[PDB]
Amino acid sequence: GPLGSDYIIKEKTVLLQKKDSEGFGFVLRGAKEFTPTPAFPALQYLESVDEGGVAWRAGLRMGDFLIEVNGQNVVKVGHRQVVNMIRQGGNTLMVKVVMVTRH
Numbered sequence: 001g002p003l004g005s006d007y008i009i010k011e012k013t014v015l016l017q018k019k020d021s022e023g024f025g026f027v028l029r030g031a032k033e034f035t036p037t038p039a040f041p042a043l044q045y046l047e048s049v050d051e052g053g054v055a056w057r058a059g060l061r062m063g064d065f066l067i068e069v070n071g072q073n074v075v076k077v078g079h080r081q082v083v084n085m086i087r088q089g090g091n092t093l094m095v096k097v098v099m100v101t102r103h
C-alpha cells in the first residue's frame with residue numbers, strides 16, 4: 001500500500017511418506033540471533049522441488065520457507081542441524097512451511 005509493502009502469507013503443513021530408494025524430492029538451502037520478518041520468515045527455504053516428487057505431490061513448492069520439522073521449530077536453526085533433523089525421521093517427514101508473495 002501507500003504506507004508499506006503488502007503480502008499474502010500461506011502456511012502449509014504436510015506429511016511426507018517416501019520409499020527407501022528415493023528422496024523427499026527437494027533441495028534445502030540456508031539463507032544465512034535472527035528475527036523473522038514477512039520478507040524473510042526463516043533461515044532455511046526450498047531452493048528447488050522436484051516436479052512430481054514426494055514433496056511436490058504433497059504441496060511443497062520452490063521458495064517455501066521452513067518453520068517446523070517433526071514438531072520442532074527450525075525458524076532460527078542452522079542448515080546442517082535442520083538437514084540432520086530431517087534425516088532423523090527416515091522415510092517420514094512432517095513439515096510446516098510458509099509461502100510468501102510480495103507486492
Ligand SMILES: *C(=O)CCCC(=O)N/N=C/c1ccc(C(=O)O)cc1
Pocket residue numbers: 027028029030047
Ligand atoms: C544444498 O546442496 C543446497 C545448497 C548448498 C550449497 O550451495 N553449498 N555450497 C557450499 C559452498 C561452500 C564453500 C564454497 C567456497 O568457499 O568455495 C562454495 C560453496
